[PDB]
Design a protein around this ligand. Structure first.
Ligand SMILES: COc1cc2c(cc1OC)[C@H](CCc1c[nH]c3ccccc13)N(C=O)CC2
Ligand SMILES: COc1cc2c(cc1OC)[C@H](CCc1c[nH]c3ccccc13)N(C=O)CC2
Ligand SMILES: [Mg+2]
Ligand SMILES: [Mg+2]
Ligand SMILES: [Zn+2]
Ligand SMILES: [Zn+2]
Lengths: 323, 318
């Protein structure tokens, strides 16, 4: 029903949106309806003269190119990252900091950032001599692919949502989107976090108390880390959402491990369904990856993200308590 | 006949155009085969000679015969120049046989399927290649992908007898080297070579960590790629004629499409000779001067010839 879905989408500005309920109520179109809602909320159709029928046509085609048969890296994950990026962009420490084009780039990058993901890792694709790894010379294999598909779909019939941007706007947005999606490669995490830490330690704020970002390198680095935080935000969400994300990533990992075991390869970490500890893996994920990242983001925008960090820390203690 | 010319495969200034003619437009194949035997690579890595020839022929076929510069003759020239640079005395022990294999294979594939237009042209025209590769080292990613993909054709897997680790190490090194031939990386590459020269440790060069060794290999193949002005003048002048034909054809396409014409690509305004002098002064000589410092004094004859050729091109400007 449309009324109940409209009611749920009133939460689009809130951390912890019931994204699985929105997927059900929208008829498995969470990415389309959440993107459309966000574009209306931020007045992006009027600002960039995006025809509404073109937006819907592109969104439905993009959503179609996520795999409905992968447990984690599907259109619900994309919708979740889009919405989480949308909330992070609204944080008071960043008010009036980014232009309308940078906002468009960050939201578009989130929407396409995992498109056509096959449900296995870059290393699996490299180690199996996949056609994707051969195409991309073993370097950010999935992320180059997500970008290429995301942009190529703009060329389908009535899909060019950027048709009314100027040529310079299109060139700038394309560069920013590429910079952002390539930064979601998990092998870049340590370098991205090291740079975010440096920016926190050298942070400057303006007279209005918002973050001072006066060059492309700093601006794109904040947008890269923002989308990376959104991508790694599952343990910061209310527990009933977090546990569903955990169930889904473990299913994807175990299916990868079954293909590795069947092929005689070493099983990747956390992918052996016969020797895995789901709870210990979440605590380690939080301790070594997610909390170091979110604690640093929370410092950059202090005190805006304190409640998100509080939820992360509660969820860590809950998983720890199940061991 | 063709055999006599191949006797100087170990000399800077091989008559590569004569070899291209005398081999029926197969310079990459015959030069690669000759080099693999001078370095005993077929025995070291147990490469079936017929597999080596089948792959080389196939690779050569994927260079475009209607591209005046970035064709199979260029690929053969860079291969042969790397082969000579690998024999620099100051590098007499630095690199292992697999590293030698990687530098030579990388040279052979480093421009395969080149369309005769630049990365910037491919980006600004919204080409399929730039869409595939997200505007980042577009050509060089493609050269690699084609070069490795051809290994999978029938009786083309020249690395069939390398160990699994050797194949994985060779692949990484080839990728690192070919990606470094992107001209947009030149200044960063040169800066690293300069830093290495300043921190140079010698007994002969001592390079201990992979990062330093791959950097020397990157800069070496880069030097080979940019070696035309260091060759004997009759060779250099042919390379100049060929690159200018390729540039002018690209500029004809940019003019028509309404784009800004790339530097040196406007046939109605370009000075071929001024462009060569500027090319040497700003790119080729700073690079080869720094290389010469790294292997001092083994590059001094190459540097001398470059400086002679620069003097000659300058004298052709009224
Ligand atoms: C909800 O839980 C998860 C969600 C996700 C992951 C792992 C989760 O739980 C262990 C992994 C992290 C990959 C990864 C790379 N290096 C690591 C080192 C340690 C741990 C993980 C990783 N993802 C894979 O695409 C993203 C989503
Ligand atoms: C024999 O002469 C040449 C040979 C080559 C080039 C230029 C030559 O002569 C002007 C260019 C150099 C790169 C380059 C592209 N745009 C530039 C602008 C300024 C400086 C360098 C470049 N190449 C292009 O594939 C490699 C071979
Ligand atoms: Mg991803
Ligand atoms: Mg090239
Ligand atoms: Zn993701
Ligand atoms: Zn080349």
């Amino acid at each position: 029903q449309e009324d109940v879905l409209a009611k749920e989408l009133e939460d689009v500005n809130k951390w912890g949106l019931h994204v699985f309920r929105i997927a059900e109520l929208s008829g498995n179109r969470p990415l389309t309806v959440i993107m459309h809602t966000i574009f209306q909320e931020r007045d992006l159709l009027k600002t960039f003269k995006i025809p509404v029928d073109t937006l819907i046509t592109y969104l439905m085609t993009l959503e179609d190119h996520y795999h409905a048969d992968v447990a984690y890296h599907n259109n619900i994950h994309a919708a979740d990252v889009v919405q989480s990026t949308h909330v992070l962009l609204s944080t008071p420490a960043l008010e009036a900091v980014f232009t309308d084009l940078e906002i468009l780039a960050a939201i578009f990058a989130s929407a396409i950032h995992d498109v056509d993901h096959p449900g296995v890792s870059n290393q699996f694709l490299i180690n199996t001599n996949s056609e994707l790894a051969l195409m991309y010379n073993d370097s950010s294999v999935l992320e180059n692919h997500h970008l290429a598909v995301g942009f190529k779909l703009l060329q389908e019939e009535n899909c060019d949502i950027f048709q009314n941007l100027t040529k310079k706007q299109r060139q700038s947005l394309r560069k920013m989107v590429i910079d952002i999606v390539l930064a979601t490669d998990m092998s870049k995490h340590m370098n991205l976090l090291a740079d975010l830490k440096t920016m926190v330690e050298t942070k400057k704020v303006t007279s209005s108390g918002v973050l001072l970002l006066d060059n492309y390198s700093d601006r794109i680095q904040v947008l890269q880390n923002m989308v990376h935080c959104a991508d790694l935000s599952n343990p910061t969400k209310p527990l009933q959402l977090y546990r569903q994300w955990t169930d889904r990533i473990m299913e994807e990992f175990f299916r990868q491990g079954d293909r590795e075991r069947e092929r005689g390869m070493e099983i990747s970490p956390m992918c052996d369904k016969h020797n895995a500890s789901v709870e210990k893996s979440q605590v380690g994920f939080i301790d070594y990856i997610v909390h170091p990242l979110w604690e640093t983001w929370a410092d950059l925008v202090h005190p805006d993200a304190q409640d998100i960090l509080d939820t992360l820390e509660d969820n860590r203690e809950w998983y720890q308590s199940t061991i």
